[PDB]
Design a protein around this ligand. Structure first.
Ligand SMILES: [Mg+2]
Ligand SMILES: [Mg+2]
Lengths: 150, 149
């Protein structure tokens, strides 16, 4: 499992100009699920996202508070392209989990996130859809996470 | 050297509320200079970014065309937070090149991009600054790139 995490002042997902979801301050997670991914990686990745210290405290010290410390929001979007192998210049996605299983895995992942944090502060894209993910990256701050190695 | 590349329908940078840079369709590249990066990694990374096949052809075939094939734009922003977290739950900076040496590499990287592609299609943020980077990720499509190893 891989994730790209971007700290946002706001973020939203549109499908065909229709706004699907939107968050204010918090974190946008692009989530790459691999073929070899299991419940262990699912649970480990949730813990890492929720505990990632990307926010300031009241004094303004950097890297001192997680999304949960701040009671901020999380926008998760499924992103199989992160499971890319770069032989030549064309991407190959053989390491990504196929969409039939991946949708179930993704849904279970979002559900662990909601039960570990607060459901109302967790927003999603639309798994199969051609989306525009509007990301107002605050800083910018961008962190790569991986769980096969936690 | 590490990069996160996002395919965009548009992207922009604001500092202090003012939009200082914007592109239309293309890629937004967040670039992380590492401690032992050389001109070698820099040249390799430019090449990879410029030929990355993240665009469709004119028949709609996925993964077939690069930014240059499409004559699309590139917004490049410096981002030192791309190094591995490994231990703890905060960004890790010990592997990032100190800002002083890094700024020279970053500017060299932009000059290489411009020389190898089209200068008028290349935009950047503002190296020192606290930026809002507005990214309309198209798909979304996101690719992680890395040189040395
Ligand atoms: Mg993200
Ligand atoms: Mg990017």
């Amino acid at each position: 499992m891989k994730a790209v995490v971007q700290r946002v002042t706001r973020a939203s997902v549109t499908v065909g100009g229709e706004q699907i979801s939107a968050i204010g301050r918090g974190i946008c997670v692009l989530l790459g699920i691999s073929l070899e991914d299991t419940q262990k990686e699912l649970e480990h990745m949730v813990r890492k996202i929720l505990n990632l210290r990307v926010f300031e405290d009241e004094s303004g010290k950097h890297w001192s508070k997680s999304v949960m410390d701040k009671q901020y929001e999380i926008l998760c979007v499924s992103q199989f392209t992160l499971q890319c192998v770069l032989k030549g210049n064309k991407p190959d996605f053989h390491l990504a989990m196929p969409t039939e299983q991946a949708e179930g895995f993704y849904n279970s992942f979002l559900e662990q996130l909601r039960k570990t944090y607060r459901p109302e502060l967790i927003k999603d894209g639309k798994f199969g859809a051609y989306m525009q993910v509007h990301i107002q990256n605050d800083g910018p701050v961008t962190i790569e996470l991986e769980s096969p190695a936690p």
